[PDB]
């Protein structure tokens, strides 16, 4: 069981800086006097790390449910053994396999079960009156468990339950990792005499117990123990004491680390590759000593941030309208079938007519069907009365849809109809259009029925006469220009789409987009996807070409189809990076040089040199750079760049 | 299971009972239109071939 806390004044969390902390053995092998690099999860050096306080003098008690990333770093400058253990899980509601690594004064229990975790589990220590010793009595960390398979008990560990307010004497660090379901624990106790601002000393971490559970964790939370002395009333609402403690929580990131080993086999120092340019030079050379000279570490690539595509100047349309504006149309038993291929189609003009009575278009959103394209577009045109326009829908039953043109469930078509009584009907009786009323059975969708056979009703054949039990299925209309609104001739066109493996021939392309120049961007001009700048060229193309090559046979010239301007193509990433090092036992700062990248910072002939000031005086040089310019460490004293004196 | 949204990595178990969407219209997990329940029962029979 658990109880709830009351609202009180807390302290906001602080942020401190790590100093060569979070280094552990990445493997269980022995290495002597070697400098090898591994790609695992480590804490970055000089990184921003969180800080949580636990002192009483006020009433600081923070237990946030921090998310468990790919590896965490838990360091504590423990003095009076305040913190007891840690919990892990995803939702903490007895639904997933949670964890409980809790350390009591007698034995260490690691129970991976589905505990009922409350809002703020904690350990309660009560001070006895007759006995002058602190003992743990309030065991409120969970309610009960449901089912589990793993339960491990580690070696016993003695503990002191008395809390004080003095300075810390020991430092404990913990690293928890989860690779492919396997739990990892690394820890080592290191004595120290300090309160905050952790020392710059180096100490590796060795694993103690390896835990093969086989699950994934996304959240974690730490546990603290408070004391119930005679000063406090003894209620866990507003009066309590927690001694003095401070635990640091840091997240591990995947970086390459260069590990140093002595002849005894222990780790003495670690060098990162993505923290400092000087540290990058140390780990690429696989040595801790760097001499004066030039060095190449990696390359500089200018990644584009935007992509622009424009195939046409504007969207266009091909000759059409005969399926809409015509002298006459067909009936429903034999309707006109039209196929659209190798035609660019615009549906905006088909909507801004403001003359259609009805429009139903399912499957695709009508406002966003222009950008998406399909392979083939089928146009089916037929006439119908005003009261049968409601029947044309997927999932309807009647006398016209089930016998002439069935609508299937997966109908992504587009139905357009309008009133054309002034042309499709005439005085005296317009009976030029026919329809089918009688049929033996149902028909498949997208099927045309042109059979004129007389539908037999009874069991007596008639041999094609007009007698008994034999009715002719095709019947005339009742169109008249003097009718109302429910029986007018409506011209229905169905615009269906096909889904099959073929390039989109009929499509409205990406039209006009925002044009950007003089920046390294990505473009797709109908034949290539190249990342580069677009400068204004001075060479005119013949009026029948699109692309342009060079002596080296590279597409470095393209014509924009918007208004026919010629734009050059030039890559934005040139060469790599370089670092200038004065050498060992001389300096610590370094200068970063770019090979062929155009831009304290000095624009040299051989690219950009940063971190080194330029001096007009000329001396003899020792570290070459290129193009008659060197770098050296002179007079405090910094790295200077100058023309080499002959 | 007969249908899935996309490819799955090897040595992975999927126990998702969510109703697959084939189009762009949600169904609120009913037996409606343009959607269907992905898990289907077998057709085992002792008198099979």
């Amino acid at each position: 069981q658990c109880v709830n806390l009351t609202t009180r004044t807390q302290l906001p969390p602080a942020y401190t800086n790590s100093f060569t902390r979070g280094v552990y053995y990445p493997d269980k092998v022995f290495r002597s006097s070697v400098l090898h690099s591994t790609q695992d999860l480590f804490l970055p050096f000089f990184s921003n790390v969180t800080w949580f306080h636990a002192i009483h003098v006020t009433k600081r008690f923070d237990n946030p449910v921090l998310p468990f990333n790919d590896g965490v770093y838990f360091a504590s400058t423990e003095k009076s053994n305040i913190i007891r253990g840690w919990i892990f899980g995803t939702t903490l509601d007895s639904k997933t396999q949670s964890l409980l690594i809790v350390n009591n004064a007698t034995n260490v229990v690691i129970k991976v079960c589905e505990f009922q975790f409350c809002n703020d589990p904690f350990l309660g220590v009560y001070y006895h009156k007759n006995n002058k010793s602190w003992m743990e009595s309030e065991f409120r960390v969970y309610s009960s468990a449901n089912n589990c398979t793993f339960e491990y008990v580690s070696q016993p560990f003695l503990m002191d339950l008395e809390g004080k307010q003095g300075n810390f004497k020991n430092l404990r660090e913990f690293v928890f990792k989860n690779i492919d379901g396997y739990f990892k624990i690394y820890s080592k106790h290191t004595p120290i005499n300090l309160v905050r601002d952790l020392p710059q000393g180096f100490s590796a971490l060795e694993p103690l117990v390896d835990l093969p559970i086989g699950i994934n964790i996304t959240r974690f939370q730490t546990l603290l123990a408070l004391h119930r002395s005679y000063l406090t009333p003894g209620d866990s609402s507003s009066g309590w004491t927690a001694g003095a403690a401070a635990y640091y929580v840091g997240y591990l990131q995947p970086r390459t680390f260069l590990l140093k080993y002595n002849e005894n086999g222990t780790i003495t120092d670690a060098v990162d590759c993505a923290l400092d340019p000087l540290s990058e030079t140390k780990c690429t050379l696989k040595s801790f000593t760097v001499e004066k000279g030039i060095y190449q570490t990696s390359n500089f690539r200018v990644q584009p941030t935007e992509s622009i595509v424009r195939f046409p100047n504007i969207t266009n349309l091909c000759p059409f309208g005969e399926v809409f504006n015509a002298t006459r149309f067909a009936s429903v038993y034999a309707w006109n079938r039209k196929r659209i291929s190798n035609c660019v189609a615009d549906y905006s003009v088909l909507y801004n007519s403001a003359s259609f009575s009805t429009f139903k278009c399912y499957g695709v959103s009508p406002t966003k069907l222009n950008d998406l394209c399909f392979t083939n577009v089928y146009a089916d045109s037929f006439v119908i009365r005003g009261d049968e326009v409601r029947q044309i829908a997927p999932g309807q039953t009647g006398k016209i849809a089930d016998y002439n043109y069935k609508l299937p469930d997966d109908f992504t078509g587009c139905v357009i109809a309008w009133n054309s009584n002034n042309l499709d009907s005439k005085v005296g009786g317009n009976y030029n259009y026919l329809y089918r009323l009688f049929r033996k059975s149902n028909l498949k969708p997208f099927e045309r029925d042109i059979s004129t056979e007389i539908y037999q009703a009874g069991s007596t054949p008639c041999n094609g006469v007009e007698g008994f039990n034999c009715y002719f299925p095709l019947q005339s209309y009742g169109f008249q220009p003097t009718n109302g609104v429910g029986y007018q001739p409506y011209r229905v066109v169905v615009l269906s789409f096909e889904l099959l493996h073929a390039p989109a021939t009929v499509c409205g392309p990406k039209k006009s987009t925002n044009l950007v120049k003089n920046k390294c961007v990505n473009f797709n001009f109908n034949g290539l996807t190249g990342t580069g700048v677009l400068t204004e060229s001075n060479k005119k193309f013949l009026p029948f070409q699109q692309f342009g090559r060079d002596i080296a046979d590279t597409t470095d010239a393209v014509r924009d189809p918007q208004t026919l301007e010629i734009l050059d193509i030039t890559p934005c990433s040139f060469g790599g990076v370089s670092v200038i090092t004065p050498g060992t036992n001389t300096s610590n700062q370094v200068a970063v040089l770019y090979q062929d990248v155009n831009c304290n910072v000095f624009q040299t002939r051989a690219g950009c040199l940063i971190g080194a000031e330029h001096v007009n005086n000329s001396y003899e040089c020792d570290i070459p750079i290129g193009a008659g310019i060197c770098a050296s460490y002179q007079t405090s004293q910094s790295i200077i760049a100058y023309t080499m004196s002959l | 299971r007969l249908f899935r949204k996309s490819n799955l990595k090897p040595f992975e178990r999927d126990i998702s009972t969510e109703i697959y969407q084939a189009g762009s219209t949600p169904c609120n997990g009913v037996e409606g239109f343009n959607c269907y329940f992905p898990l289907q029962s077998y057709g085992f029979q002792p008198t099979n071939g």
Partner: antibody
Amino acid sequence: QVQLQESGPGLVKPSETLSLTCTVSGGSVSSGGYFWSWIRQPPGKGLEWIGCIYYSGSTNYNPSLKSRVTISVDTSKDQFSLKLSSVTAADTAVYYCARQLWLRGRFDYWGQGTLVTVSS
Amino acid sequence: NFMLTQPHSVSESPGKTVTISCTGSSGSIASNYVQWYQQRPGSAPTTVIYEDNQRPSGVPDRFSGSIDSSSNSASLTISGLKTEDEADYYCQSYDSSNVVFGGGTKLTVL
């Protein structure tokens, strides 16, 4: 994104001319052929459609409000205005300039409603 | 002359399901798209559903619309009533170049 702000006086005398202007910031009136419309709503009553306009001269009006609605679009100031003639005391309604794309569809963005009361 | 007939007052307890109708007089509901609008009192209206079967991004999935063209009544089925649903409901149509709105439904607890 984009937003629409209405302006003009909140009062009008009977048998006079109403002048309500709705301005657009964060987008272009002519771009995308985005239609434009006006909707009023009396207090305690349902929404009433007044008329719709295109960035060109195309327009349409409610037959109950026909021959009384004059709406014009100026692209240089990126706004559209509506003029109402022969206003009466029954025209007290909350006017919304209506941002809408599909003429048979929806008013996806609604401007804030200016209170219009016939001034006596 | 085409209008949308909508019930004035609809009252059910929270947690249940309701049905709001929108009946067309002359034109069929299947002829044109119907858009429903949920408007706070003293605030701009907001489209709660459109295209008669699918939902805008941002509203809960409880707002469902259905069309039965036989009775010419546009239906909006709303389930699991809460406090924030207490507003007006208007249905829209188009007829022929003349947008026609609905009467208005007052969704109340009782």
